[PDB]
Amino acid sequence: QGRRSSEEIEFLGVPTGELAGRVGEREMRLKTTGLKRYKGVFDRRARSL
Amino acid sequence: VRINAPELFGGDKGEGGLDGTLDVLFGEEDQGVLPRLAAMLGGLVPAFRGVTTCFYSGLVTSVNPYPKKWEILRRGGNRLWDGNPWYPEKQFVWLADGQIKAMNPAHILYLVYTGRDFRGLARTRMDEASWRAAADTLYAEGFGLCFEWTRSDSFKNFCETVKSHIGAEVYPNRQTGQISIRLLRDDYNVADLPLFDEDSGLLEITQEKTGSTSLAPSQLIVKYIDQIDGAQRQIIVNNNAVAASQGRRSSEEIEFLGVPTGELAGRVGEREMRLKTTGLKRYKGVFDRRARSLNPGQPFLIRSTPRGIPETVVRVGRIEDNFLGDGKITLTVVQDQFNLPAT
Amino acid sequence: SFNSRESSLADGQPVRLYQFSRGAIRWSYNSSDRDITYQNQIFRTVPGGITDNGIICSGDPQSDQFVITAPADLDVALLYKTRSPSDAIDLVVYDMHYGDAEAAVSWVGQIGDVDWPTVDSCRITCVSEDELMDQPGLTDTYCRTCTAIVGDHRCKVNLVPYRVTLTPQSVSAWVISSGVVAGYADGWFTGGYVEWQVDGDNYDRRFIEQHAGADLHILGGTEGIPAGGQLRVYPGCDGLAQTCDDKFSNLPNFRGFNAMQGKSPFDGDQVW
Amino acid sequence: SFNSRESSLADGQPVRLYQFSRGAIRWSYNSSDRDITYQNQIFRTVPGGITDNGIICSGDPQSDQFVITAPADLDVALLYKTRSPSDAIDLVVYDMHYGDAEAAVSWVGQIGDVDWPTVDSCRITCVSEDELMDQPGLTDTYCRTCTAIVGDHRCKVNLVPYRVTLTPQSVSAWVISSGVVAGYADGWFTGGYVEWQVDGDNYDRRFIEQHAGADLHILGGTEGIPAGGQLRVYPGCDGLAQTCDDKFSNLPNFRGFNAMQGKSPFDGDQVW
Amino acid sequence: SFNSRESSLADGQPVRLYQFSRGAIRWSYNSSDRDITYQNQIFRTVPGGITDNGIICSGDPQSDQFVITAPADLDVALLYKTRSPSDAIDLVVYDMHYGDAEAAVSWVGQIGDVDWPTVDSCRITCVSEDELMDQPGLTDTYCRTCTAIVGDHRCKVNLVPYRVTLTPQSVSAWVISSGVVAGYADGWFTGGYVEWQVDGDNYDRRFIEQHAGADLHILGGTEGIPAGGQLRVYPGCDGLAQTCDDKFSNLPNFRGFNAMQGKSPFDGDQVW
Ligand SMILES: [Fe+3]
Ligand SMILES: [Fe+3]
Ligand SMILES: [Fe+3]
């Protein structure tokens, strides 16, 4: 990144800092890993999903 | 700083006063650690670099253990810009016999865009000429503003507020790619501006937007904050001509909290009144490649004899061009009625 | 017979009439191919026809607009081409059947907006009185100034003695100059407006940005001002109590609050 | 002659050129059926053609996107298929007419999004620098930790001495193991990132979830990491003042507030 | 074989079955042209066919509706024509292939809305249990009254002893009159509801606006009330503590707060 960027997320339900960090690592990995999204078309074989 | 007010609240016979010693650490690049603060607090005491901090020690109150809330006035603008101020000769605007040290809004926008602590864009990406001209014009007009950051909102909101306060457009130039700023002022020559005609590069004009005059307000209330005391103040702008025609009174309230002086607020309020009650004509024209070099906020002339529209000065708005495929270049323009009076 | 004709299954001959009125001047148009005489009023036939889109009454002023389509040469709409008239053009719509002298009123309103999408057509958006209820209604502030437009029903100041009738000396793009006003102190006319007769009993009004010596600054330019026409100019009130009483002696009606209180609460922290 | 050709009514030969640049590597494409040489740069011809939808400049970053359509085999877009490159691909668009050596710059920006709706096509959404102004700008909190990313312009810490160059011993789906890092205390590399050369002067960066012994945990998996390529690994700062000074001795630049105050107001209820 | 048939490329014979159930009464319909027997249940064939629009599961109750199209003479939908039944009609949708005795459950829900756009068709909007989560969940107020509907799980009051079975004397448009209730004090039945058997083990309930002498006022009119059918009428609780204990002696379960405090804070200004 050329310039610093920051966002604020509130997890007021979290009672301990370690738990908040555990979930924050998940959020960071999700938001910076570059997910690939697909919109597929399926026949009846995908009926039970 | 030696603050001497032991009897501010009546002393012993009252509620006490303010007596003590105040030490201020603004947070310079080379600011060192204050021995007194670290010694008193102890532990791992950093230099508190990069942030303005103060250390007070002394009497706060007496008789009752309930200290009172404080209010501190503080000017700023020079300690910003990290280490390299930009065009400092016009950074500040002096008002009210030097009482108010207002800052040029152009400098605010430049700092926000290029500030390492805000966005950190390369200084090479900004068109120096346009920004310098805007700063010079603003300083000549003596148009300064004061602001405070506590909303924690996106840069877009603050930038939009600043633009509305000053009446300017900030766009990324399509040709050179740098950020350019254009002021909406009647500082143009009629001849040099390009002309567009049915035979000169105009395809079709569809929207007319004749507008109306019986509507629109007759009285405008402008609310501003005076920085000397920080107390809410307002001014009233009236439109006698429209008021006489109006059957019943109408009023609107607009807040310009960035304005530090009533005269400046009235100057901008007159512009707003003229814009909102002069009956602008809006056109949605269609042009060929001859309108390729236009940019947002650029005024130009349009003539179309069949429509009965004489040579008219309009300012560019929304732009949608199609260089490949349809070949349609469509522009939305508004009549030129933007001007900031100096009195 | 109008209601009977409407209920009739074979005599339906709809014809819609429009009446644009501005004080003493009326414009009459009809959607048929021939002129119609009604109540001693003849309605012109517009080459190309005049038609609307329908009437909507849903209780939402923003959505219940009335649209009129007519050629670009329509006389009533031509006025809006250069500048919107100061007064609002009231519009009344009648409905009648050919061969019958009875008509029913359908829509009543005023011009809201006019535009010319094509050289061969013009679209007029008509608004009803219900749309005037969207603006605020506070109209009250505890500030030092008067907070009243000179001459309003609250100031109760008669401007007829202050009326000045004059013929302008020279008219420019933005400045109208006259020597008669040169005899008044600077800023005497600031805040006033200029009214002059356009046609019949209707006048167009323009506000004044500033008055200085013999030159008057007109907001929005001087376009449309006749160079030799008779002009009526009224003064303007700054709103200050000293200005209100020294000039107009209307202090008893002064609506401003000069020195009652600026901040003083009765639930503060320290009175001294 | 470019402007003259644009004004010309019979010499119109539009041709749009695209230049995708990432540091020292440039990709050149043209929308015509033959290669074009401009400024000593030859633009390849894509079988099937490359075309856009138009340029919009309305002041709204969300709405003023630029869309590119090209086959699914496009080289520059192929990189995004597996993982987005760490660096942003700057894009510059030129306009020129066949037979003329002069071109005009039209659009400048960077890749915003890429997708492959069909096997025979690919759609690229390009964003301008104006869209980077929607994120907040607070970037300030009065908390105990440093509130600064190690190595940023605020920490002023030089990581070049701490650079470690190594060849990984074994690479797994989520864990990259090397014996050289086994000699460091647990958590030494936690918070750091791994950078390695992909092509030319461009490197791809990956953050580290945790460091334990000889095994390194890579956020998002180890896909794309060469099994024998040279890797550069930097440490990470926890942000605590003790961590900041004991390891890096950067306490004077410590941006955190460890023990100045947690809640203490001067307008509370009872000091004791 | 249902799954095998679905995977089969040549035996696809889709048939959708609908089962509308209300307690002890079930309505069975099929989309084919002949009746289908499944689990000892035969599904009628509707002349004109019954078809849906599809199943959506996006997590948004407002958007994930299920639509059914059927003729206007459908028996199950005919009930809603005059008044919505008191109980909700649960709907279960099965899927099976002709010639196979196995079916799979696809959708489960209840009737949400019914309308008759055309004389030859009817549209039914079915909602899932997820839509019942949009209403608030506070359900708590510190007021004087009980804040509990008589007979709910919180009041714990048995209404079976108070049940009164009677045959109405006369039925009018809005008033149902009976002499048996004339022997009770005015307002005894106020707040109660009347339930009577419609079909099988299902009853329709109606609330009572007011009770006065021998006349009972029914909210929303008395339409649908049989003139000679047997009716069960229950009393109603005003909610006042005196009313709760004197009549029902349920004061220990009184959920209201009569005289604990109306405003008294412990951080006010002056206690006296
Ligand atoms: Fe007055
Ligand atoms: Fe650090
Ligand atoms: Fe109860």
Residue numbers in the entry:
A (entry chain M): 295 to 343
B (entry chain M): 50 to 392
C (entry chain I), D (entry chain I), E (entry chain I): 2 to 273
Give the original sentences from the paper that presented this experimental model.
Bacteriophage Casadabanvirus JBD30, from the order Caudoviricetes, is a temperate phage that infects the bacterium Pseudomonas aeruginosa. The virion of bacteriophage JBD30 is composed of an icosahedral capsid, long flexible non-contractile tail, and a baseplate. Using its baseplate, JBD30 attaches to Pseudomonas aeruginosa via the bacterial type IV pilus, whose subsequent retraction brings the phage to the bacterial cell surface.
The core of the baseplate is formed of a trimer of baseplate hub proteins (gp53). The shape of the baseplate hub protein trimer resembles a trophy cup, as it was termed for phage T5. The baseplate hub protein is composed of seven domains. Domain IV forms an interface for binding to distal tail proteins and gives rise to a long linker, which spans the whole baseplate hub monomer. The tip of the baseplate is closed by three α-helices, each protruding from one baseplate hub domain V. Besides playing the role of a baseplate organiser, the trimer of baseplate hub proteins also provides attachment sites for the tail fibres and receptor-binding proteins. The upper baseplate protein (gp50) is composed of two domains, each formed of a central β-sandwich with an α-helix, connected by a flexible linker. Domain I of the upper baseplate protein sits in a gap between the domain IVs of two baseplate hub proteins. The upper baseplate protein domain II is attached to the surface of the baseplate hub domain III. Residues Cys147, Cys156, Cys238, and Cys245 coordinate a putative metal ion in domain II of the upper baseplate protein.
